[PDB]
Design a protein around this ligand. Structure first.
Ligand SMILES: COc1ccc(C(=O)/C=C(\O)C(F)(F)C(F)(F)F)c(O)c1
Ligand SMILES: COc1ccc(C(=O)/C=C(\O)C(F)(F)C(F)(F)F)c(O)c1
Ligand SMILES: COc1ccc(C(=O)/C=C(\O)C(F)(F)C(F)(F)F)c(O)c1
Ligand SMILES: COc1ccc(C(=O)/C=C(\O)C(F)(F)C(F)(F)F)c(O)c1
Ligand SMILES: COc1ccc(C(=O)/C=C(\O)C(F)(F)C(F)(F)F)c(O)c1
Lengths: 281, 281, 279, 283, 282
């Protein structure tokens, strides 16, 4: 007789929360240089995926097509290309600050990591991701000339795409950018939760694919992606200024993300699963 | 190799649904409220993403050729992430309860007071989460504001048109559409219990929710978010035309689909199997 | 790690099909009717969703450029979830039974009277489910009502044109198309029987269902729903055309495909393998 | 306890070679009529999937769409819907000549099958696939009237798509058709290898889908699909001749496909993995 | 009764690094002929998938369509069709130079391979991929006429797409070509890591699919794809020159792909997982 074995590749409820807490408290045990290296690699991967998505969007930001689709196909394609960043980050074992704003905050709420340790991890991850992203921007994208102003509408679709995304990201106000970053980090935290839950390749790919595509097309502000995009837009001499790039956007973006991951998502999840995490431990 | 299966039969899926509904009636009130609020917030967030994508594909010059088609298709492609954002974190939505908890009430595993308390708390929490996300994120972000310029005002136009379409049905029409919506939603809930592999977990629910959204059926929580955002953004709808015209018939149709349309036939089909299962323990 | 196999050779698939057919000849008449009606309801729901999507992509300005290609493609994209709905709820349609139960008939595991019970009840219940959904949900939804304005009439126009296409074949053509449809459905049943993984379950049947849908092959239960809702919304078709001209040929072709096209050859192939498995 | 057991579904390399050789050797012991039936069933499945792909491509061959898109969308949809023939064949346990060219040839290289049996298997598979494909082309396509000349540019796009594909397939010279068939059978045997190394259902589906879609879009010639398409085109009275169908596309396509299955892939893999196979047999 | 076994098919980070080092070491023992055959087969597969991608892009390079969408549709379709190559390489057991620039370089850093062995394997893989790709560009692509210059513009879309792609690849400078190569191979090495960490068919297909499509659409330059494309362009008499192929694109491409495989990725991951591998081997 045939007796195939019934197997579950997914979990839920308290299991995912406990795994998230464990993943968070794991990171504070690394040394400063290991954390720096991981953050640098994550920032570089984000920059690579962002460059690829920008090339695709500029491809679909073409002069004549844009007059019909009005910048719709380009954003869809950019959001279709970006998600692979999650695979790059997770498979290499590197971490991104946006995910940490949930994982390490959860670990801290349970009182696994300490406040100074949390500060160390957050600061190192942020710095590493930032310098990784800007280094990739320069060395790969800026020197490749892929985003240079050609001064000819027929060929300048990539530069125009970058300029238009930068202007969109730069002409918000404080509160609107904060809100967009909140939504961004909600999506990112949900994606990390998904991978923490769906312990299979299919889920690992597609759940975070849909999450990242949704937050990319939606227009939510991601701190690392915004750092890369704003820096490279500055490099290729778009209309955005450095004061605009940093004060207007990246400060409210970091904040929104921080709130989304720590207060909006971490605190109620902790309130829900505190007793379960205790019972497991 | 060892032969395995991640898919169970209908009897086992019915048992799993009954148990999943039963367990709902043991959480304290505050945890149920928190989980319902989280589910409502997730639905509002994914609806915001879907609406922004649809508006992007609602470009005024693209309308003239494919009017309302690409925008709706993209909205239905983007929305289904909410099912994952709910399941992977243990949150619950009223719609899936309208099947699971009533099925657990049929088999005598819940009590009437318990059932009504659970349903009321779930609905109120979902409402709070959805409206809170709508206001804060969507309306402090200016994403759907009126720009008074046809070339740029496609997000507002898409939202206004969807809101009018929703609030211009009749009672019977809306009841039928909500019935269809909840049949799809509860069928996806059944899928996530019969399929225990990540690939199925994502894709079955994706297809179900996409068919829901494209078919124009009516979902109570998504409707709450959409009409509240259409009211603060000041489209051409009215508070009465929102609540009385859509959500009351929508809620009634959703509950009918959950409890009567599918709950009773499944109960009659599988009550003997459940009784035997119980005799086995 | 550990080496795991999620598939079966095909002899095991044949044994699984025979056992699946044998199982459903044991339920009560009422349980069978309930499952058949739920299956009909599911197919009606998915047909409604796919028809609405096709109507949306039937907009007249887009239609003047792309014909009906986009509408048909999107309808085929939306339809397939019906397989998931039926399989996950434990219900059956006539089309799948044409293979599953006819196999157990050949293998002597089901008797003629029980086979006729299963077949008749499945057909009647699927009919009841389809028409009831068509009335209660589709007709009262007003989605496919004739809004004479040409620009909003795409939903009605799509259904009208599809109904005309279905009812304007000849006997032989409709029988052939139904044969193709039921061959695809039986192959999807074999797919789910063979692939015990979520990815398999979803995609193997998704592609097959979309293929038969776009190909213009005729499904008896989907045809029932479409023709009944077309009559409800007052398209150009007649009841005589709906039933005599299309439905009877469609049923005949689907049964022939499920019973003689795939049943007899697979039996002649795997009869010894099943004999030994029974040992 | 949170300790799921680690599993792997892809076990490739030497193991895939063993699986291919044993799958080729299993075909040796089946009776003649069993192989004949399996071949006929596979040919019918190919005919069905090719009919579906042709109808979809014709649907996207609308003349107004054509004058702004050419055939690109039509071929894209054709290759998007065709790939289910592989699943139809493999799930039901039938055999196709193109996929046999690798496995049965490899089992003959290892001296597991004998030359007489190998010739029997190849001949029966080819003949049965021919019968199945032509039978589906007549009894399910010609009678369905789906590909019929309507004589209206608005409605005749299915017949026009089929006619254009047929004319394209019968204007190659010997060398070009042989080359395209070589590419096609490389893709087909490679899909067979992927299915032999993937045992999840997910890869089982999508690896095959991508391989067959690439082969279809690239224009590589598949012998079985070519018989189906050319026969249905002749039945409907397209701008084509039986000479152009058989002595200008089918023979070179068969030769190229067989060479790709047996020489381009095969002997290479034999050289790579025969010592590993010998060690396996020592076990 | 109802109690499925919890299973995971994914183990990233540390385990992926260990498996990468082991995979790198496994190459340093194959015989010269075996490695050459594997590299030739991999080059042949890359040529086949590049030919299919080019044909699809040429289909979607129709002059009327191109006049509206430019080259967006053709590039997307090429990126959709190409990723199948990874599947060919992994399932056949063959090897490609670009993934070796990480795997074998890692096995060298850990000292599981020697320097002579590493250089031999790397050069053999490169030469075999060269021979396979060129033999496919001749015996399959050129001899089929699929990319012939059929002057009439209505049908001359495959040739025009190939010509424009070649002109794009040929008209960079040293630094830009090197950077785009660095990007391509970071993507290829990440796809290899995806394959090594995910041990299920779904991930196998889809992670590498997305990585390869992202690299291809992004315009990043792959040495094996570059050789195939430029050789077939030379064969079909495009506007590029014999010198412009090798001294303008393939030399910088190879350089940058090697940098990506070895220093950009290899050094940080080594500095991350060195002591953990030390632990794992004791
Ligand atoms: C290792 O576990 C993880 C995995 C992913 C992230 C993450 O945050 C990734 C992004 O934010 C992103 F930008 F790459 C994308 F949105 F694309 F996913 C993380 O922090 C930790
Ligand atoms: C078993 O865990 C679940 C998962 C999902 C739901 C649910 O209700 C989902 C929807 O309602 C939805 F898909 F329509 C959307 F989320 F988009 F709103 C649920 O009730 C319970
Ligand atoms: C094993 O559980 C099942 C699942 C499906 C069927 C079936 O028959 C499917 C169709 O008929 C269909 F594909 F046409 C559609 F689903 F669209 F209705 C069945 O018989 C049994
Ligand atoms: C039983 O295991 C198999 C599986 C597949 C084939 C095969 O050959 C498949 C094709 O050739 C194909 F994909 F091109 C199409 F089906 F489309 F024709 C085979 O021979 C044997
Ligand atoms: C056997 O394990 C592998 C599998 C694949 C590669 C590889 O490198 C493949 C490519 O580079 C490529 F050409 F297919 C693409 F550029 F698309 F990625 C490898 O090195 C080792």
């Amino acid at each position: 007789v045939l007796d195939p074995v019934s197997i579950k590749s997914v979990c839920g409820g308290e299991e995912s929360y406990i795994r998230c807490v464990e993943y968070g408290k794991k990171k504070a045990h690394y040394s400063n240089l290991n954390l720096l290296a991981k953050a640098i690699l994550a920032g570089m991967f984000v920059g690579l995926c962002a460059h690829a998505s920008g090339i695709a969007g500029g491809l679909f930001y073409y002069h004549k097509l844009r007059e019909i689709v009005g910048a719709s196909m380009s954003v869809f394609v950019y959001g279709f290309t970006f998600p692979i960043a999650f695979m790059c980050i997770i498979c290499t074992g590197s971490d991104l600050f946006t995910g940490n704003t949930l994982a390490v905050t959860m670990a801290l709420y349970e009182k696994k990591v300490k406040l100074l340790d949390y500060l160390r991890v957050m600061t190192i991850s942020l710095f590493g991701n930032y310098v990784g992203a800007v280094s990739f921007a320069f060395f790969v994208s800026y020197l490749s000339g892929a985003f240079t102003n050609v001064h000819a509408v027929e060929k300048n679709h990539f530069f125009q795409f970058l300029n238009d995304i930068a202007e969109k990201k730069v002409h918000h106000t404080f509160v609107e950018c904060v809100s967009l970053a909140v939504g961004c980090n909600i999506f990112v935290c949900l994606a990390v939760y998904f991978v923490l839950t769906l312990k299979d390749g299919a889920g690992y790919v597609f759940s975070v694919f849909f999450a990242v595509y949704a937050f990319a097309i939606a227009g939510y502000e991601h701190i690392i992606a915004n750092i890369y995009t704003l820096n490279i837009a500055l490099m290729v001499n778009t209309k955005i200024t450095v004061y605009q790039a940093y004060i207007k956007n990246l400060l409210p973006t970091l904040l929104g993300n921080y709130i989304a991951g720590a207060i909006v998502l971490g605190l109620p999840l902790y309130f829900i699963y505190k007793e379960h995490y205790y019972n497991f431990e």
